[PDB]
């Protein structure tokens, strides 16, 4: 949930992780918390059709402007269609689901554009600082525009994954992180994320 998460975030922040006598952020790491999913790439052509995104497993998905979303698996043929209400259909690029060929061409453009158990995007939204991606499996991912750093948050393991400026991958157990603290920068991203999660529950 976003409540579990919000609880965990409110918590690590309440603790002011960066105003420490000694910040031993190295110790708050945990290689077993690496989330299974995150958005490798995204494309906001939503002024026209919507947001196309690529999961780290290389499956591509587009959440259209009808709130319908087509997801092409990383094998290239399999499809998942989620209607405006959430019904889930499993078709195929070759099986030809009649009426889906316009939609399927729009996905291949997004697929081609980005390359040139599967959790889809529940919803998203940008602010001037970042784009927020809320995945069905519960993780809120926040990609910050300015310095290209990223926060992927999984409420299932109370874990925060932080891809930084140099492009290094680092996963922290939010609460260990609440024992050892972390540098300013990550501590402020968790505050931002906190605000972002509130909102995912507010406007939701």
């Amino acid at each position: 949930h976003l409540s579990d998460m919000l609880q965990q975030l409110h918590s690590v922040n309440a603790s002011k992780p960066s105003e420490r006598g000694l910040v031993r952020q190295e110790e708050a790491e945990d290689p077993a918390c690496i989330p299974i999913f995150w958005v490798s790439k995204w494309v906001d052509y939503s002024d026209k059709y919507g947001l196309g995104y690529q999961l780290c497993d290389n499956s591509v998905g587009v959440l259209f402007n009808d709130s319908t979303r087509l997801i092409l698996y990383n094998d290239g043929d399999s499809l998942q269609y989620i209607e405006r209400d959430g019904t889930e259909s499993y078709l195929t690029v070759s099986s030809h689901p009649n009426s889906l060929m316009k939609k399927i061409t729009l996905l291949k453009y997004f697929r081609n554009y980005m390359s040139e158990r599967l959790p889809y995007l529940r919803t998203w939204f940008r602010t001037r600082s970042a784009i927020i991606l809320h995945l069905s499996n519960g993780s809120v991912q926040i990609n910050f525009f300015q310095d290209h750093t990223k926060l992927i948050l999984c409420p299932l393991m109370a874990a925060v994954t932080y891809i930084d400026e140099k492009r290094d991958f680092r996963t922290y157990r939010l609460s260990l992180l609440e024992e050892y603290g972390c540098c300013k920068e990550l501590a402020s991203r968790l505050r931002y994320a906190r605000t972002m999660v509130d909102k995912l529950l507010s406007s939701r």
Binding site: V39, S40, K41, W42, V43, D44, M114, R126, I131, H148
Partner: peptide, 7 residues
């Protein structure tokens, strides 16, 4: 404006 940054 914008998309992911890849490449």
């Amino acid at each position: 404006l914008l998309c992911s940054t890849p490449n």
